[PDB]
Design a protein around this nucleic acid. Structure first.
Ligand code: MG
Ligand code: MG
Ligand code: MG
Ligand code: MG
Ligand code: MG
Ligand code: MG
Ligand code: MG
Ligand code: MG
Ligand code: MG
Ligand code: MG
Ligand code: MG
Ligand code: MG
Ligand code: MG
Ligand code: MG
Ligand code: MG
Ligand code: MG
Ligand code: MG
Ligand code: MG
Ligand code: MG
Ligand code: MG
Ligand code: MG
Ligand code: MG
Ligand code: MG
Ligand code: MG
Ligand code: MG
Ligand code: MG
Ligand code: MG
Ligand code: MG
Ligand code: MG
Ligand code: MG
Ligand code: MG
Ligand code: MG
Ligand code: MG
Ligand code: MG
Ligand code: MG
Ligand code: MG
Ligand code: MG
Ligand code: MG
Ligand code: MG
Ligand code: MG
Ligand code: MG
Ligand code: MG
Ligand code: MG
Ligand code: MG
Ligand code: MG
Ligand code: MG
Ligand code: MG
Ligand code: MG
Ligand code: MG
Ligand code: MG
Ligand code: MG
Ligand code: MG
Ligand code: MG
Ligand code: MG
Ligand code: MG
Ligand code: MG
Ligand code: MG
Ligand code: MG
Ligand code: MG
Ligand code: MG
Ligand code: MG
Ligand code: MG
Ligand code: MG
Ligand code: MG
Ligand code: MG
Ligand code: MG
Ligand code: MG
Ligand code: MG
Ligand code: MG
Ligand code: MG
Ligand code: MG
Ligand code: MG
Ligand code: MG
Ligand code: MG
Ligand code: MG
Ligand code: MG
Ligand code: MG
Ligand code: MG
Ligand code: MG
Ligand code: MG
Ligand code: MG
Ligand code: MG
Ligand code: MG
Ligand code: MG
Ligand code: MG
Ligand code: MG
Ligand code: MG
Ligand code: MG
Ligand code: MG
Ligand code: MG
Ligand code: MG
Ligand code: MG
Ligand code: MG
Ligand code: MG
Ligand code: MG
Ligand code: MG
Ligand code: MG
Ligand code: MG
Ligand code: MG
Ligand code: MG
Ligand code: MG
Ligand code: MG
Ligand code: MG
Ligand code: MG
Ligand code: MG
Ligand code: MG
Ligand code: MG
Ligand code: MG
Ligand code: MG
Ligand code: MG
Ligand code: MG
Ligand code: MG
Ligand code: MG
Ligand code: MG
Ligand code: MG
Ligand code: MG
Ligand code: MG
Ligand code: MG
Ligand code: MG
Ligand code: MG
Ligand code: MG
Ligand code: MG
Ligand code: MG
Ligand code: MG
Ligand code: MG
Ligand code: MG
Ligand code: MG
Ligand code: MG
Ligand code: MG
Ligand code: MG
Ligand code: MG
Ligand code: MG
Ligand code: MG
Ligand code: MG
Ligand code: MG
Ligand code: MG
Ligand code: MG
Ligand code: MG
Ligand code: MG
Ligand code: MG
Ligand code: MG
Ligand code: MG
Ligand code: MG
Ligand code: MG
Ligand code: MG
Ligand code: MG
Ligand code: MG
Ligand code: MG
Ligand code: MG
Ligand code: MG
Ligand code: MG
Ligand code: MG
Ligand code: MG
Ligand code: MG
Ligand code: MG
Ligand code: MG
Ligand code: MG
Ligand code: MG
Ligand code: MG
Ligand code: MG
Ligand code: MG
Ligand code: MG
Ligand code: MG
Ligand code: MG
Ligand code: MG
Ligand code: MG
Ligand code: MG
Ligand code: MG
Ligand code: MG
Ligand code: MG
Ligand code: MG
Ligand code: MG
Ligand code: MG
Ligand code: MG
Ligand code: MG
Ligand code: MG
Ligand code: MG
Ligand code: MG
Ligand code: MG
Ligand code: MG
Ligand code: MG
Ligand code: MG
Ligand code: MG
Lengths: 147, 97
RNA sequence: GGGGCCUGACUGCGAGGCCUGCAAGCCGAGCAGGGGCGAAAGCCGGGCCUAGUGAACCGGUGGUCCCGUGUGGAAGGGCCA
RNA sequence: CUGGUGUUGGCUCUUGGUCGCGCCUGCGUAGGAUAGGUGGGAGCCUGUGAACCCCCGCCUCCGGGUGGGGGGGAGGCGCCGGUGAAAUACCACCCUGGCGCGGCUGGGGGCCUAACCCUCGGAUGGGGGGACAGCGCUUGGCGGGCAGUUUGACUGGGGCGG
RNA sequence: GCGUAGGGUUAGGCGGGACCUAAGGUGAAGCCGAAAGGCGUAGCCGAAGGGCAGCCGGUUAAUAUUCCGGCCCUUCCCGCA
RNA sequence: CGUAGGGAAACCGAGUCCGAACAGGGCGCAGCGGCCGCAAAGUCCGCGGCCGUGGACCCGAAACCGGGCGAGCUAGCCCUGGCCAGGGUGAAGCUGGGGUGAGACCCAGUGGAGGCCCGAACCGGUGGGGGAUGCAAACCCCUCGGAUGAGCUGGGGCUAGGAGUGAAAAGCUAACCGAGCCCGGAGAUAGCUGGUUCUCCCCGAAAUGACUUUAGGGUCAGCCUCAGGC
RNA sequence: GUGGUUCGUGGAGCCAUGGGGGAAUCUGGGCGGACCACCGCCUAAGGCUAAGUACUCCGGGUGACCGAUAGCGCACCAGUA
RNA sequence: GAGCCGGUAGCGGGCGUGGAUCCCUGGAUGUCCGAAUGGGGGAACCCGGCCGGCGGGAACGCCGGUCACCGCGCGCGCGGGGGGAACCUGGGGAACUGAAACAUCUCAGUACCCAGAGGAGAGGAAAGAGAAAUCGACUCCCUGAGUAGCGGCGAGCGAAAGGGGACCAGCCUAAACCGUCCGGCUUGUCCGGGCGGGGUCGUGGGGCCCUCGGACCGAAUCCCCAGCCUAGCCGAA
C-alpha cells in the first residue's frame, strides 16, 4: 500500500514521503499510531497542498530578505561617537546600530540577529553579518567615527 | 458466516458436484457426474476494530471491502461525532455508503 | 501331396434367391476400374463346408475438405476406414 | 486430516532462483604464450611515471595468470610474418562458470506486536498465546457416522449345485 | 346425580394475588443465525417451599374459621406524647 | 398443412445419393365423359374406433418426503414437598476387667450400624385356576418378590421423529413404534387381487415361436374381426 | 467454485456471484456462442415509472350445471353435535 | 309513504302524516381480549406510576386522560408492528413417481416454510436482440414450434429472433464545474459532510472557455366537473 508518513521512520521513508508497504503493516500499525496516512486521493491533496504554502512562505521570506539586502549592500551605516583616536570611550552596540538604521535610512531590524559578540570599542570601518534568514546573510558596512 | 456490513454480501447456495473419468478434450469418453449436493458459500468475513471519535468501532465485514471501512472513517472526519456512542457512530458511517 | 510365378485375404456396385417375427446371419451370376496365374478355354471379391463372436450409445487414430453461428480462419463436428 | 491462497505484519541469520553492477574465468596439431564468441579494429602505453628485482593473496591442466606492494623508473605489445578451422595491442556487446554488494522472491531457524484468540474487581489499559490457531474460497485423502440404491433368470416348490 | 321452574356459595385473620425466591420460562446490555428464529450475567415471571395476623359455639331446607355471639390479633393513613 | 424429392452436408433438382462412369442399385418422378360439367391429390369443421401426455376404467397398499401438533400415558434428569405400622439380628465406637514393657487381642455392659432379616400400607406381577362378544381393549381370587433403598410419591419443569429417553427389551415416546400423530405433495406407485350396469343380430379365437433382469408382464409374427380392392 | 438460459463440461460464450488478483473515462469499455482479426450493436457497476396481465373473501348477470346419498363439508342455528 | 316495537305468537305496555318501523351516507357511544403496547398473564384475568374529578376522603375504590419496543428526522414530531380467500415477487426447498431396477436425469425450483407488497405484484426506457446491411423499454396472449437445440442422445426437457394482436410514455439522479453553511488541525488555492445550481446522453452527451441566435411543448403531483358506486322512483293495456 502507498501511504503518507507523519514521522520519519528509520530506513523506511522521510517525513511527508510516500512509500508502498504491506497493507497489514499499514493498517494495523502505522495508521493507528498516528504514524502515517493512506495515500488516498482525499487526504492526498492535503499533502500536495501544505508543500505549497510551506514552500510559498519560505520562498516568500527568501525574497522579503533579498529585497532587504539590496536595500543594504548599497549604502553605509555611519555612527558618530565621542572618542579620542582609535579607541572609543563609550561603545557602539547592535541596539545602537539599530537606532542608526532606524534613525537614518528609515530601516528597522532585530539586533539579536546581527552578528557581533563583543561590543565595538575602537573606530575604523567594519563589515558585519546580520543574518536575517539562514543561508541568506547580509554585509552591512558601518562607519564608526567620532565627533 | 453472515452478512457484510458494507457490501451487503450474503451466504449464497452452490452445488457440490462430483465428477469421474477422463474429459473429451483429453481424448476420453467424457466426464460423469457421480453426486450433486447443495453446499453454501460464505463471504470471507472478518473483524475490523477501528477507533473513531475516541470510540472503538468494529465491523463484521467481508475481507473484500475491508479497505472501504477506513474510507468510511477517513470520510467521516467532517461530522459532529464526539459525545455519541458506538452504535451511533456505526450508523452514521453506514449512512455514507 | 510337391513346386513355379504371385496377393482377388481387391475397389466401385450387384440381378435373383436361402433363411426369417424384427434386426441379423448366408449364397451369389454378371458390369466397370486395376491387377495376378494360364499357351488357351478359363479360374480368382481369402480358407472343402458348417462355430471361432457382440447391436446401438459414448470416445480414439488416418483420410476426406461437406457445415463453420456477423465475414475470413480456427474450436467442434458429419461422411469414409 | 491436509497443501495453496485471503484475513496477514515487523527485524535478523542461513540456504535456492533471479534480474542490476564490480568483477573476474575459459588450456587440443599448430602457433611467442592458457585464445571464451561476434564484432568494431593498424595504433594503443607510461608525472592516472615503462623493460626488468623482490614481498602477500588468487587460480592453479604444474605451466603459467591476475591483482597487487616497493625499486628503478621512461619502455612495451600490435599489424608485418610464424600459425592454426578460428590469432593476439586496443575498444564494445554477449556466454562458461564462479565471487561481493544491491535488487525480488522460496524454503528453514530465532525474536518481536500491533491483527486474531483466551484472560484481568480496573478495559483507548495490563498480562499469556501469537501472525501459528479460528474463520472464508479451494486441492486431495480417510470417512456405514449418516443418506440414497443394487444385490439377474431358468429351476418337476426356493435355496445350495449346474 | 334425569325434565321444568325458584332458591342457595357472604372473609382485613382460611386459599390465591397487590410479598419473596427454585428448577425451568422469558429477557435491558451483548453474542449467533439465509428468513422464521436460536442463545444470554442482571432484572422480571414462575410453588403444594419461605413468610404472614382466628380460636370456640350457635344459626339456615341449602353457605360459614365467611353471617351471628363471646373472647383475641394483623397491616396501612392521620393525630398526640 | 400441401404444391418435389434425394443427400450427413455444401449442393444439385424430375431427378438425386454411393461412384471415375454415359455401369448397377437405393429412396423418387406420369383422372372420366360430352371447353364444359363429373371425380380426385390436398385441406378444413363434424362424427366414430384406437394411440401419446396427464390420476386416464373404479376402490385398495405396505412405504418415501415436507411443514406443523403432542412428555396431562410412558422413559431419563432438574426444582420443591410427602410416605415407609410393628417385631428380629445386634457392626464400628465408648465404658469397664483381664492382658503385655507398651501392645495386638479376649470377655461382660452400653450402644444401634446395614442397597441386613420377618411382615402390613405403598410399589410390584412368581406359579395356578377363573375370565375370553370379559366387571376390565390386561381385570378377580389364592400363592408370591421388595419393602431405610439403586425405594416409593404429589406438584411445578426440560429433552422428540432418523430425533428424544433408554440398569438395553429395538423396550418407550397418548390403548398396535425396526422410525409417533395430524395435515399436505395426493387421485404417490401397484407389471398383483378385485369390481365394471340395457337388448337383439353375424363371425369368432389363444394359451404357439423369437427376443425380453424375461418367465402370472410386454414388442413382432401366428390364430379372430371390420371396410375397401383383386 | 456455482446458479440461470434449450445448453447434463460440451467446442461453453452470454446473465448472475461466494473466493483471489485487480484498471481505465470515448484514443474509453461490454457484445455479436471458446480464441484472433475485420465489420457492426450497444453504453454496465444509482433509482422511478401508468395501462394492457393474474387471482376471486365480496356484489350482480347468466347456464343443453346439481335438485336433499345430488350440489360447497353445512338448502335446517355447521366447521355445529 | 302507512304501518312498527328482528326470526316470534303470547303475557304486559307503547309508537306512527307533528311522516314512525325500514333502507342508504356521515357522526357519537363502543366494557373486556386480541399486533395488544404501563406491568404481568394459564387470551378475554391480575397488579402499577403520573395529572385531574368524585365519596366524609389521608389511607381504600371508582371515573377521565397519559406511560411498551423499533426506525428515521432537529424530550417532541411523521412512520412501522398485525390480518386478508386465493393471485404476485424475493430468501430457502424435498419426495413419492418417470426412467418398467437405479445413482446423473426427471417429478421441479412444482408442493411446502419464511420475509415482503399491493389492489394488483414482478418487469421495464438497451453496456438488448442478431444478420435483416435491419429491429428499437417492459408486460400478456396468439404464432414462430414440440422448430433450433438439450439429453446415462435413455426416459424425457424445451427456447429465443422474427410476424400478427392488446396497451402505449417516458423520466429523476451520481461525477466534472459555480456558490453556501458547518468541523477537523496538518492553516488552505486544503481535505470532509450537508443544501442549492448545473447535468443525464450513444447521429455519443455533458462542464468549463470564447463566439452567434433568446416562444412553443407539458405532466404520472394539485384543483373543478361530467360519469360511475353505495338507498330509490314513474312504468301501457
Ligand atoms: Mg466443489
Ligand atoms: Mg476431440
Ligand atoms: Mg456427461
Ligand atoms: Mg481485522
Ligand atoms: Mg482484495
Ligand atoms: Mg457505492
Ligand atoms: Mg497346392
Ligand atoms: Mg502353392
Ligand atoms: Mg510378376
Ligand atoms: Mg435382396
Ligand atoms: Mg430378412
Ligand atoms: Mg459373422
Ligand atoms: Mg475385368
Ligand atoms: Mg483380366
Ligand atoms: Mg501371359
Ligand atoms: Mg466373382
Ligand atoms: Mg474357415
Ligand atoms: Mg488349398
Ligand atoms: Mg458372442
Ligand atoms: Mg445407454
Ligand atoms: Mg463427395
Ligand atoms: Mg464465423
Ligand atoms: Mg468451406
Ligand atoms: Mg485475413
Ligand atoms: Mg490455418
Ligand atoms: Mg477440424
Ligand atoms: Mg474432422
Ligand atoms: Mg497464508
Ligand atoms: Mg516466541
Ligand atoms: Mg493460517
Ligand atoms: Mg470470524
Ligand atoms: Mg472436498
Ligand atoms: Mg449401521
Ligand atoms: Mg463404505
Ligand atoms: Mg441411519
Ligand atoms: Mg445405508
Ligand atoms: Mg427411489
Ligand atoms: Mg426366482
Ligand atoms: Mg429362455
Ligand atoms: Mg428343486
Ligand atoms: Mg414336485
Ligand atoms: Mg411344478
Ligand atoms: Mg421343467
Ligand atoms: Mg446359483
Ligand atoms: Mg340428591
Ligand atoms: Mg333435578
Ligand atoms: Mg313434558
Ligand atoms: Mg325455594
Ligand atoms: Mg371475618
Ligand atoms: Mg394474603
Ligand atoms: Mg392496594
Ligand atoms: Mg421474583
Ligand atoms: Mg431464549
Ligand atoms: Mg438465566
Ligand atoms: Mg417485584
Ligand atoms: Mg406459597
Ligand atoms: Mg405456603
Ligand atoms: Mg401471621
Ligand atoms: Mg394466612
Ligand atoms: Mg389464636
Ligand atoms: Mg344456606
Ligand atoms: Mg415529637
Ligand atoms: Mg437411380
Ligand atoms: Mg427404380
Ligand atoms: Mg368435388
Ligand atoms: Mg376429419
Ligand atoms: Mg391404435
Ligand atoms: Mg394426472
Ligand atoms: Mg381414469
Ligand atoms: Mg379407495
Ligand atoms: Mg392409494
Ligand atoms: Mg427409503
Ligand atoms: Mg427413511
Ligand atoms: Mg412425567
Ligand atoms: Mg407421570
Ligand atoms: Mg428405568
Ligand atoms: Mg425438595
Ligand atoms: Mg423430599
Ligand atoms: Mg422395619
Ligand atoms: Mg425398629
Ligand atoms: Mg460413638
Ligand atoms: Mg481399655
Ligand atoms: Mg434395628
Ligand atoms: Mg433391609
Ligand atoms: Mg425382608
Ligand atoms: Mg415393571
Ligand atoms: Mg398375577
Ligand atoms: Mg411379566
Ligand atoms: Mg395371573
Ligand atoms: Mg382352584
Ligand atoms: Mg392366566
Ligand atoms: Mg385360562
Ligand atoms: Mg378394539
Ligand atoms: Mg385379553
Ligand atoms: Mg388377590
Ligand atoms: Mg408374602
Ligand atoms: Mg406380597
Ligand atoms: Mg431392595
Ligand atoms: Mg421382607
Ligand atoms: Mg433417597
Ligand atoms: Mg416426581
Ligand atoms: Mg415430577
Ligand atoms: Mg407437571
Ligand atoms: Mg424435546
Ligand atoms: Mg420419522
Ligand atoms: Mg415427521
Ligand atoms: Mg419435523
Ligand atoms: Mg440416535
Ligand atoms: Mg396418539
Ligand atoms: Mg402405544
Ligand atoms: Mg421407516
Ligand atoms: Mg402411540
Ligand atoms: Mg398443511
Ligand atoms: Mg406428484
Ligand atoms: Mg414402486
Ligand atoms: Mg338390468
Ligand atoms: Mg408361448
Ligand atoms: Mg428380438
Ligand atoms: Mg439383460
Ligand atoms: Mg416358472
Ligand atoms: Mg400382436
Ligand atoms: Mg370385404
Ligand atoms: Mg445446471
Ligand atoms: Mg468436457
Ligand atoms: Mg454451466
Ligand atoms: Mg443465445
Ligand atoms: Mg466474485
Ligand atoms: Mg471506441
Ligand atoms: Mg479499448
Ligand atoms: Mg460482461
Ligand atoms: Mg468477457
Ligand atoms: Mg467476446
Ligand atoms: Mg451481441
Ligand atoms: Mg463471433
Ligand atoms: Mg472494434
Ligand atoms: Mg448488442
Ligand atoms: Mg454507467
Ligand atoms: Mg422497480
Ligand atoms: Mg401499477
Ligand atoms: Mg398492469
Ligand atoms: Mg358470485
Ligand atoms: Mg329444478
Ligand atoms: Mg334436473
Ligand atoms: Mg336429505
Ligand atoms: Mg347433503
Ligand atoms: Mg326427496
Ligand atoms: Mg321477542
Ligand atoms: Mg297480550
Ligand atoms: Mg363497567
Ligand atoms: Mg397491557
Ligand atoms: Mg407482556
Ligand atoms: Mg390523584
Ligand atoms: Mg366510588
Ligand atoms: Mg384509572
Ligand atoms: Mg400486511
Ligand atoms: Mg424463487
Ligand atoms: Mg432438505
Ligand atoms: Mg428418487
Ligand atoms: Mg406420480
Ligand atoms: Mg412412463
Ligand atoms: Mg410423471
Ligand atoms: Mg422409478
Ligand atoms: Mg417402473
Ligand atoms: Mg427400489
Ligand atoms: Mg427440474
Ligand atoms: Mg419460491
Ligand atoms: Mg410475521
Ligand atoms: Mg402480510
Ligand atoms: Mg388493473
Ligand atoms: Mg410498481
Ligand atoms: Mg438510462
Ligand atoms: Mg413453425
Ligand atoms: Mg408446428
Ligand atoms: Mg441416441
Ligand atoms: Mg426443467
Ligand atoms: Mg419477442
Ligand atoms: Mg411484435
Ligand atoms: Mg381488452
Ligand atoms: Mg412506443
Ligand atoms: Mg460543498
Ligand atoms: Mg464532447
Ligand atoms: Mg413525474
Ligand atoms: Mg309499480
Amino acid at each position: 500500500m502507498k501511504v503518507i508518513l507523519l514521522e520519519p521512520l528509520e530506513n523506511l521513508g522521510d517525513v511527508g514521503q510516500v512509500v508502498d508497504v504491506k497493507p497489514g503493516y499499514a493498517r494495523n500499525y502505522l495508521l493507528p499510531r498516528g504514524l502515517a496516512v493512506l495515500a488516498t486521493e482525499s487526504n492526498l491533496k492535503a499533502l500536495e497542498a501544505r508543500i505549497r504554502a510551506q514552500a510559498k512562505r519560505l520562498a516568500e521570506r527568501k525574497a522579503e530578505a533579498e529585497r532587504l539586502k539590496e536595500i543594504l549592500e548599497n549604502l553605509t551605516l555611519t555612527i558618530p561617537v565621542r572618542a579620542g583616536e582609535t579607541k572609543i570611550y563609550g561603545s557602539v552596540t547592535a541596539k545602537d546600530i539599530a537606532e542608526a538604521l532606524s534613525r537614518q535610512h528609515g530601516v528597522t531590524i532585530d539586533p539579536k540577529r546581527l552578528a557581533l559578540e563583543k561590543p565595538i570599542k575602537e573606530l575604523g570601518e567594519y563589515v558585519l553579518t546580520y543574518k536575517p534568514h539562514p543561508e541568506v546573510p547580509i554585509q552591512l558596512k558601518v562607519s564608526v567615527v567620532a565627533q | 458466516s453472515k452478512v457484510c456490513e458494507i457490501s451487503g454480501k450474503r451466504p449464497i447456495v452452490a452445488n457440490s458436484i462430483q465428477r469421474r473419468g477422463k474429459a473429451k478434450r483429453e481424448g476420453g469418453v467424457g466426464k460423469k457426474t457421480t453426486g450433486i449436493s447443495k453446499r453454501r458459500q460464505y463471504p470471507n468475513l472478518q473483524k475490523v476494530r477501528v477507533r473513531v471519535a475516541g470510540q472503538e468501532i468494529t465491523f463484521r465485514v467481508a475481507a473484500s471491502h475491508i479497505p472501504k471501512v477506513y474510507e468510511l472513517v477517513e470520510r467521516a472526519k467532517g461530522l459532529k461525532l464526539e459525545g455519541l456512542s458506538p452504535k451511533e457512530i456505526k450508523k452514521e458511517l453506514l449512512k455514507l455508503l
